Design a protein around this ligand. Structure first.
Ligand SMILES: Nc1ncnc2c1ncn2[C@@H]1O[C@H](COP(=O)(O)OP(=O)(O)OP(=O)(O)O)[C@@H](O)[C@H]1O
Ligand SMILES: Nc1ncnc2c1ncn2[C@@H]1O[C@H](COP(=O)(O)OP(=O)(O)O)[C@@H](O)[C@H]1O
Ligand SMILES: [Mg+2]
Ligand SMILES: [Mg+2]
Lengths: 55, 226, 49, 590, 592
């Protein structure tokens, strides 16, 4: 039982590699839509509204 | 609870919200209420503590269309083991039942020390019918409740008056209390009694009595299961 | 030297009822003891005879 | 057009508002949250908002509506669910299409799109009409086959024009009253303030009983159509179950189930269970929701709505009484109405009087309860209504010394006290027989002599038996039941049988959900005959132990009398009890 | 510098103090009384002065120090007595030449003239040091040697210069740390706000028991090193004696004895007796006083200073915990801290809540009790300490329903309830075995199985014997003992023996001043074996009366086992006990 128990806890490279695809997908999505998202954030910041309080 | 509402409704999950130290939450309210110098209720608690506790508690339930639900189990610790305290009183008035943990049972060494008599489940009537569980669930529950109350009364009678004065029914009910507390309620962690197995054990408890004495059991169920 | 009862109006009324019942039982059992003591004295005299 | 000067929770304080009146609905905030002015300290006016104050800023407009809290009485409210005010929950869900209640939603209390069939009454054009008179009859449901279109009280005149028989909505004018020069127009519905009792010609003494169905209530502690009852008890104890039992099975022609300070799942259970059950009050069996109105105000709604829902329900019941329908409103958690009042008083800063409750708690409870009673509605044609107020009280800690419990106990005529000890042992309905009482037995002697002549004598005999057995049980607990008399043992056994088979009924079981008056009278007669037979046979010389051993079969038959199904009808059930009396008499010879 | 506007009791609403912070330390009056700001209503700022308010005039200056109430951690704390705001009473007495404590004495919290041998740690110039890291140690006394010098928490940077080994005073520079181009000079001591708990890397589940030395506390309701403990009980129950015995004979490395509302005579007794006693730790016989400091704020001292005393004591305990030592705080009256809080609240005008105790009392007690616990120290090198808070609650009227007692029971893990019935009749420790509980019995199974495997089973057997005897006594007291069975008589006799000999411990007698864990385990074995032998012999058929008549000698030998002095050692005492069981077994077989 002790020998089998030791092998279970050593398993971490498979888990690390499993998420490695997710990081690549996130990086790809970011590299794809950075231009659009940053541009719309810039539009929002640059274009304010001179709105007086309703009351 | 807003996280639980989001999950259960907008995500269609089955959330089991577990609040602990609702008494500590009410103490926080009292600290805020006392600082505001508002007119206090019982024991200095805010007069709107019922409304605040109701706002917290009533965020649990099933909703039409949504396939999710919230099942709150707020762990309330009564301050002086007195159910008449404002926090347990309002919590029991708002919520749909209560699980009562008994200091006397804990001293006796029973785990879980759930004192079934003060405990209540208002949805047991609709959730413990035929089809959902066995046809004997309600009758067995009512009979166990009646016999456990008779057992407590018989224990008080044995403590006050002499034991020999106890009738045959009183002695049988004392034995029922002993085996109910020390075999049925006592479960230990990780035991995992299925509802049907628990009902079978409850019937084993109820088989002590003759079928004539079992008043709360309907005759059809008594014939079928005894 | 006091019962472990949570102070409440319902508890107070229950304990007043318990006190009244205890006094009634005290009086009734003392009278029963007196009657049985008279019967026991008669039984002792009859036993000697 | 005022402006909020303070919020401090549910009680906003709007400034720059002159001309305000107490209990006037203002429209607080930009979302037009409704409120009710409850203190006018000069220009300022403290307002209790009926919606959730969260976001109201200092400077938002407050405008005065010009009307106290008014319900929209009329056809269209016989199966709907209403909030603490009068807001159709079904319409809110169908409009906002959200599982929550939108803040400040403005939905009409009655559906203006439903075309209601109208048939004019005996009143014709040119006749002199008085407030409360009937000028139509709208077919609403199968059960409510004629919703009389009452002329609003405090509004009279000469009829100038009446609509012909046809399908009309709730916004189309139906009647034109000349009045004193100003020709008013009356539609199907009409509004009425909730804190102003609806006028009646003269209240009467309620005689016919409200058959609750529960054996304990309908036998030992009866209620009348028009009586005020209370069911105080701690959480549990079956207050809500008794309330729903009188909601499902009752002699009332209509019902308003008020749920102030009640769990939302209670209203959900009512809405899920009522459409299943049927009653044969009309020609054919029809669903309960065709004669039941729910003023459902969950406990998380604002305390102002909790205060308002009681009055909304009672004024709806008064309206259906004015139509001549024997209504039995069932208020839930009148103690929670009192708790809402206490919270409002605390937020205002008024000095509490008794256990934190406001000083005017007794006055408010009396004003609410006095709306009950059998009465002849004003105006022609004459017709008698009734509003039975079955209000549940939940005292804090289960002690009947609470201020709300004391005030309700002083005001009402019936009291179905519940015991936590009996509730926890699952001895439902858990009626505390020692404390419970009914002041309507003196009135009901007439109805009992008419229908079941032996009922009052049997009820008094059972009360005497229960009291004697309670005294004997106390003496037994004191003295160990040493050498108990044969008659004393008979009374103890009979009372234990009565408690375990006549005062204990599962309101959810099929056989004992509803015990009719005839079945409970037959069971009472069977129990009394069994007790009398045992008494006479032992007085003849028979030993009680041997007698019980021989008559265990008869005792089991009397026990199974509770299992006898009332669905077989009077003819079958009454004949079954006739055999039980014959069997009981047979054991007397042996 | 503000001005005094209103003086009503121990609170001083001082005006003209715009900019004062909450709980900011001030100096109210011409004598520079120590006070803390509670409320700030505009330019006004209500202050709870920690001294006597008599003589404060409207208009007295109030200085704003700028920093919260800060204890002065560092070398020299270990063998001292403090006034609640960390004022050395010895220094006050020496400076004033009066038996009183003058109002406004500003003596340094730590002696500055004393030169301490300094030994630099593994750190050197250029090593990046973090908060809580040990950059050296000082020899404080023979017992507490290497009083490790810790870098203050929230202080971080690269070491620019470190003092070489030698002799240093507290004011002398010891270290210079460069952070973001700004040099910070560090001395042997460092201040810390008492309100904020000292940070730790990660708290741990406490597992090693705190050997109190009392039989019932060590066996029936054990306490671990690093867990809160509650001792309610009326006056004369034994809370102070239990606390003092725990401080004298505990396995803890250091003691923080805090007395709030306690008599000055208890403080005098501790100061008089602790140097006389000696401990076997550290391989030598050194006085107890060398590893225990006292925070003395008696009942006649200013009311507001009891909270400061509690917080100063717990912060000293946290400091010696961050040093990696096993410390145990002993608050003498959390109830008196709460009564001080109630007095301040009533003078301020807050809502009374329950019984008059302020609504924040539960939160304050919870935070103070959460300060305790076993934890890994903040910085490298890695070392683990623990703080065990054993605070004696003093209920009003001798009823455990007081708000302070209820909050303390809700927050603590070990409850040593004291019954005044046993407080009378000289049955100390007057522990109520029915209501008392310890929640560390589950976690202590590891230690018990490691050292004394039969300890939990024996404790459970004794507990069930006590419960059965309680039920038997309850029924007998109303229905006599003319119907009991032989087993019931055995249970009653054995439990009376347990109460008379085992549970009761005379802490002021040489034999029973300190019953160690091994002696307690052996005596539990003796009593349980006596009960089992009696039960077996009677079940064999022997009448209990004749068996007691024949085995009175064995009963006396068992009941007199407490007189075995633990000073003989584990080997000698256990050798006598092994003969006691063997003789008792023989005397139960020959009799039967
Ligand atoms: N373990 C013990 N062994 C022997 N005698 C004891 C023991 N505990 C207490 N006593 C005796 O009982 C007395 C109780 O005094 P103690 O200081 O313990 O009271 P207390 O409960 O702490 O009171 P207070 O609440 O006033 O501080 C002691 O002075 C001593 O005479
Ligand atoms: N007449 C009855 N028959 C069967 N069950 C009952 C009866 N009265 C009460 N109960 C039980 O009591 C429980 C709670 O009672 P309820 O009326 O909800 O209490 P409350 O009045 O506090 O709302 C329910 O689950 C129900 O099963
Ligand atoms: Mg209810
Ligand atoms: Mg003390």
């Amino acid at each position: 039982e002790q020998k089998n128990a030791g092998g279970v806890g050593e398993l971490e490279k498979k888990a690390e590699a499993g998420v490695q695809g997710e990081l690549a997908e996130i990086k790809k999505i970011a590299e794809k839509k950075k231009d659009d998202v940053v541009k719309i954030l810039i539009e929002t910041v640059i274009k304010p509204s001179a709105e007086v309080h309703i009351n | 609870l807003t996280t639980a509402e989001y999950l259960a409704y907008q995500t269609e999950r089955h959330v089991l919200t577990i609040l602990t130290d609702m008494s500590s939450y009410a103490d926080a309210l009292r600290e805020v209420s006392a600082a505001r110098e508002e007119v206090p209720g019982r024991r200095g608690y805010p007069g709107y503590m019922y409304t605040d506790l109701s706002t917290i508690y009533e965020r649990a339930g099933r909703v039409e269309g949504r396939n999710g639900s919230i099942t709150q189990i707020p762990i309330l610790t009564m301050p002086n083991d007195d159910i008449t305290h404002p926090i347990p009183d309002l919590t029991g008035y708002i919520t749909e039942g209560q699980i009562f943990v008994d200091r006397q049972l804990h001293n006796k060494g029973i785990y879980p020390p759930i004192n079934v008599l003060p405990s209540l489940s208002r949805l047991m009537k609709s959730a413990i019918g035929e089809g959902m569980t066995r046809k004997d669930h309600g009758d067995v529950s009512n009979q166990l409740y009646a016999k456990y109350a008779i057992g407590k009364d018989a224990a008080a009678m044995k403590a006050v008056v002499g034991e020999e004065a106890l009738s045959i029914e009183d002695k049988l009910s004392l034995e029922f209390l002993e085996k109910f507390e020390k075999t049925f309620i006592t479960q230990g962690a990780y035991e995992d009694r299925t509802v049907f197995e628990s009902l079978d054990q409850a019937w084993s408890l109820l088989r002590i009595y003759p079928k004539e004495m079992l008043n709360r059991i309907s005759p059809k169920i008594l014939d079928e299961f005894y | 030297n006091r019962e472990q009862v949570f102070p409440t109006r319902m508890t107070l009324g229950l304990m007043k009822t318990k006190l009244k019942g205890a006094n009634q039982g005290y009086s009734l059992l003392k009278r029963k003891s007196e009657a049985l003591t008279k019967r026991f004295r008669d039984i002792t005299k009859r036993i000697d005879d | 057009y005022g402006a909020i000067y303070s919020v401090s929770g549910p009680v906003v304080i709007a400034e720059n508002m002159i001309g305000c009146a107490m209990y006037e609905l203002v429209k607080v905030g930009h979302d037009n949250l409704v409120g009710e002015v409850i203190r006018i300290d000069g220009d300022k006016a403290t307002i209790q908002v009926y919606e959730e104050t969260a976001g109201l800023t200092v400077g938002d407009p407050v405008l005065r509506t010009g009307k106290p809290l008014s319900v929209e009485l009329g056809p269209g409210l016989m199966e709907t669910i209403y909030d603490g005010i009068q807001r159709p929950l079904k319409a809110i869900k169908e409009e906002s299409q959200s599982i929550y209640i939108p803040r400040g939603i403005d939905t009409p209390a009655l559906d203006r799109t439903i075309k209601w069939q109208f048939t004019p009454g005996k009143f014709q054009v040119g006749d002199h009409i008085s407030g409360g008179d009937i000028y139509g009859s709208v077919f609403e449901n199968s059960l409510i086959s004629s919703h009389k279109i009452l002329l609003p009280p405090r509004s009279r005149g000469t009829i100038t024009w009446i609509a012909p028989a046809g399908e009309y909505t709730l916004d189309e004018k139906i009647l034109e009253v000349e009045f004193d020069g100003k020709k008013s127009d009356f539609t199907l519905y009409h509004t009425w303030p909730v804190r102003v009792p609806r006028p009646v010609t003269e209240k009467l003494s309620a005689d016919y009983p409200l058959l609750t169905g529960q054996r304990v209530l309908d036998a030992l502690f009866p209620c009348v159509q028009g009586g005020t009852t209370c069911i105080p008890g701690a959480f549990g104890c079956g207050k809500t179950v008794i309330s729903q039992s009188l909601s499902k099975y009752s002699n009332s022609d209509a019902i308003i189930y008020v749920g102030c300070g009640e769990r939302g799942n209670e209203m959900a259970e009512v809405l899920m269970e009522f459409p299943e059950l049927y009653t044969e009050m009309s020609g054919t069996k029809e669903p309960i929701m065709k004669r039941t109105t729910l003023v459902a105000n969950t406990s998380n709604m604002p305390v102002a709505a909790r205060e308002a829902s009681i009055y909304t329900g009672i004024t709806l019941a008064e309206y259906f009484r004015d139509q001549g329908k024997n209504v039995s409103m069932i208020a839930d958690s009148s103690s929670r109405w009192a708790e809402a009042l206490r919270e409002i008083s605390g937020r205002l800063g008024e000095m509490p009087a008794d256990q934190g409750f406001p000083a005017y708690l007794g006055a408010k409870l009396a004003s609410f309860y006095e709306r009950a009673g059998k009465a002849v509605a004003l105006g022609s044609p004459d017709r008698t209504g009734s509003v039975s107020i079955v209000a549940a009280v939940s005292p804090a800690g289960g002690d009947f010394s609470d201020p709300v419990t004391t005030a309700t106990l002083g005001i009402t005529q019936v009291f179905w006290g519940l015991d936590k000890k009996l509730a926890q042992r699952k001895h439902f309905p858990s009626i505390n027989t020692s404390v419970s009482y009914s002041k309507y037995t003196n009135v009901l002697n007439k109805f009992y002599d008419s229908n079941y002549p032996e009922f009052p004598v049997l009820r008094d005999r059972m009360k005497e038996i229960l009291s004697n057995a309670e005294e004997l049980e106390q003496v037994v607990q004191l003295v160990g039941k040493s050498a108990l008399s044969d008659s004393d043992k008979i009374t103890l056994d009979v009372a234990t049988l009565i408690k375990e088979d006549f005062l204990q009924q599962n309101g959810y079981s099929t056989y004992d959900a509803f015990c009719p008056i005839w079945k409970t009278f037959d069971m009472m007669r069977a129990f009394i005959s069994y007790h009398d037979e045992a008494q006479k046979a032992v007085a003849n010389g028979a030993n009680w132990s041997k007698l019980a051993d021989s008559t265990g079969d008869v005792k089991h038959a009397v026990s199974s009398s509770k299992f006898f199904e009332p669905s077989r009808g009077e003819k079958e059930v009454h004949g079954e009890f006739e055999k039980l009396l014959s069997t009981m008499q047979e054991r007397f010879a042996e």
